[PDB]
Symmetry: D2
Subunit: 304 residues, 4 copies
């Protein structure tokens, strides 16, 4: 498999490329940047190759700054952007416009924030099928919520299944109705009352801003999440993950929006959107999140 990383000079692009070459299913990683940063990509290329030697893993690292260098990749990772919607939306247009004409079987993974809005932009400008364009969305938010619950019940992480749907932002929605420990609904689990869901969600929603103001931004957490998504797709693992995808009325008839939703992912991208049944309160928060994401998408498309 060949994976291109656009924005490899950045904090997220460099880290994600380094850990992506360690995957056995990734035979080639192509580093893409603007023409004025190709020299920087040469240094990163040797750095990554040195790390592969240390790990006794193999991968071909290439560099490019043109459309022909990454359009034929199996998976294209979009990590380039300013760390709002207006500026990053143009960058998506520059790189992904018309990709379907050349490689109609491409899969695009969008990391640039706003991830939900820019997934819609990428799908529209690219012309690819709706199942082949996705974004990281709330995947990492769901994973960290999973750890918090597991520690509360003092169980192995694999025992906890949970999810955060909606926008990768303040309008995210934890789905308690579909949270389980060992298959047991968490509501019926002893000790659930002592778990402060509201406090835990606040940790999830605010950790992004705290990391930015102190460290500068997320590099390792997001890069590992991208590794999870790419490995799942390229190995056709068919896991139900929470990614930003185009809704076409599978959940409450809500359609024409890209937002974090449960999706069974494989080599063909989004095989299907799981039609989860939400409770009253969860549905109300989900609808509020969808309305917020749709208005932002309106602004982005106008800027394009």
């Amino acid at each position: 498999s060949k994976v291109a990383v656009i924005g490899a000079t950045g904090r997220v692009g460099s880290t994600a490329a380094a850990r992506l070459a360690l995957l056995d299913c990734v035979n080639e990683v192509t580093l893409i940047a603007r023409p004025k940063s190709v020299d920087k990509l040469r240094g990163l290329r040797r750095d990554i190759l040195h790390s592969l030697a240390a790990a006794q893993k193999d991968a071909e690292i290439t560099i490019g700054c043109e459309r022909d260098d990454y359009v034929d990749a199996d998976v294209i990772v979009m990590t380039a952007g300013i760390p709002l919607t207006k500026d990053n939306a143009a960058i998506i247009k520059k790189y992904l416009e018309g990709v379907a004409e050349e490689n109609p079987e491409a899969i695009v993974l969008v990391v640039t924030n706003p991830v939900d809005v820019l997934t819609y932009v990428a799908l529209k400008v690219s012309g690819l099928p709706k199942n082949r364009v996705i974004g990281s969305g709330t995947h990492l938010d769901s994973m960290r919520f999973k750890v918090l619950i597991a520690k509360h019940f003092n169980v192995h992480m694999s025992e906890v299944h949970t999810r955060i749907i909606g926008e990768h932002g303040d309008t995210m929605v934890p789905v308690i109705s579909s949270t389980s420990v060992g298959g047991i609904p968490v509501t019926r689990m002893p000790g659930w009352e002592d778990f402060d869901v509201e406090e835990a969600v606040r940790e999830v929603k605010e950790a992004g801003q705290r990391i930015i103001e102190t460290w500068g931004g997320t590099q390792f957490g997001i890069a590992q999440a991208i590794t999870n998504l790419v490995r799942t797709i390229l190995q056709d693992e068919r896991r139900v993950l929470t990614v930003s995808a185009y809704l076409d009325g599978e959940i409450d008839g809500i359609r024409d929006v890209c937002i974090g939703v449960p999706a069974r992912l494989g080599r063909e991208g989004v095989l299907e959107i799981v039609p989860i049944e939400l409770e009253e309160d969860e549905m109300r928060a989900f609808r509020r999140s969808v309305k917020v994401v749709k208005e932002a998408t309106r602004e982005a498309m106008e800027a394009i």
Copy 2:
């Protein structure tokens, strides 16, 4: 960690010892048999050591036929017996009686059938704490039910959590109320109606007899299951697994019986018994299974 395998000359003992030495957490495996089969254990010792060399793994393989050779082990696996209750119950008495006096921190894993009944016998004769004596029970039955459901929904196996409680036999009880795919109750999952639970359970309950009449008995399936249980305990993984354990009124006030139940397992054995809430029908089948196991336990203890 040191693990002793009593009955290493048999189909289950030999296979389980071979795969147990491959675990990184298993530094020594002691092969225990009757004095008239020590010579056979010498051949098996070199065979296993040859396999470790092929796998580039390390482990010390010892042999013994006396109490002093295995009483100080961290985990003792009881695979010796005829492949009913009366004959195998005496064998449990011979090897495990009084083990608490010498090593009170021992953990006993019982595989000899009837596993549920013989777990009670082993706990009584050994004098160990009720949390340090367990049996394989319905762990493998739950794992195979897990695979059948995963293939039905065409999802990764890790997405499916399910369980079979009760006797390792005809009175086993699948717990649909605590079965989930991605955290979603399977009842709310689209396509659940097309899954034939009754047919699938019949496959689980009868595969044992079909294997016996054709191949002779289970060797690889059960041996791998034992590897799962021992790895979980020695690495303190704290997974919720289905093993035969002593109930003391955690489920519906049913007490004084050993039967397959959900249990969080760690280095200390059964940390706790998950107090699952069952539905009407599931509770009725569970009570029928408990009554059957209790009568069999009555016969066994009398024989001792």
Copy 3:
């Protein structure tokens, strides 16, 4: 990839199939036996599927008793035979004769003893390329010799590279000239004088007889070795292993014989035979072993 195991009903066939289905690169394992053992193979199929469920791994297990069931396999493992040369030579002819006509891209690995002689038989009757027919040979013997050396120097096993070439029998030849620890020739390694080469070779060459008279035969060591060889080929790993291969004058001009030699192995079978340079004594032992293997092969071919 699909791997067929002829003789799956046996000790070596059953065990090798069980561990081969655990490899991620093996998607299907076909169990082949004589027609009067199909029912036994049904039980072995259910047992192995139980182990896969316990290990959370996936593979399709098929059953067959006809040529059409295994001729299209990528790798065919020959474990069927009496546990000599005359009787087993006929068995090889029955199964492998003309295989090139149907699947010319097949790879045959021969385990039935005499392994070197029957590797020659399989190549002749099959009509396959000389690089697509090999045998286990001295791979496991070299592996155990490697462990003994590593323990002597108290170093990690990966640090020791060594090999035993020639017949898988009494005429095997350890190659000290090409034995190294960390890249340092073992002769120059401190403590090499305290290593009793004669004692170590005695343990390796006789362990087969010791195991047979007590346990019955080699089961786990050989099964793991088959897993090693098949994984190496199917993943095109290009490791230098000691397998029985057809010599065409790469070592001292010796040709027209199958015997254990260093060979770089990949998806195309034997990519090349390493032209090792032997010392005087080592070469004389190699010629003695070749003489024994050639005479035995002549007798086998006469039996047809």
Copy 4:
């Protein structure tokens, strides 16, 4: 085990900590920086915990800016310094002076360049045993040289054993006399003549400058190397690696210097220094490198 990283705010400290927490043998990672960078370390702690959640791995991440926060660690990694010898020598003294008084069983790995010189400084100021203070040295340089050789012969990387001893700089010395492929001396290996040793050494020694002028510095290669060394020590793997260690006359009677040499590494640090035998030319280059490292170390000690 607990591993402390001094300089976690830097490119090497942050990256090394992120990959060190992924090791199963590392239960705690402590991030150490100057007091004015504690807030930045808080963000790095949250980011790394996010990566652990994504990777389904567990580890406790702590923060500190005082000696008491890291003196009781099992392994202390020194990545703090200006990216020469005079300024960095003071930094080493501040952190490691007197560490033996509090935790005499600590192991110090020095990464700050000049690595060889500062390894000597750390050993002197700490008062620790000569076997408990080491440096990264030429481990990564040897690893990349190993990959280049493997690609030339088109063999698996595990088949190549090689090392570069001496200074981690322009006076490094490749040891062809102790380079082997599959146990065969590389000089006797077919195709060795087509290998341009001078070209390969040029790539290894200069890649550091090439990376610095474009990317800024080494980040991923060195971070992975630290993970390699720490895992080797904490799991008592007994691998022969090339690290900066105190020579006491094991190689040509050269003593009173820290420089890259083959060393068998375990939980006790440097178990022993392999007394490699060098050829005429290789030994002369080794003496030249020792002369350079000794003069630089003299200058450093004067700076205190």
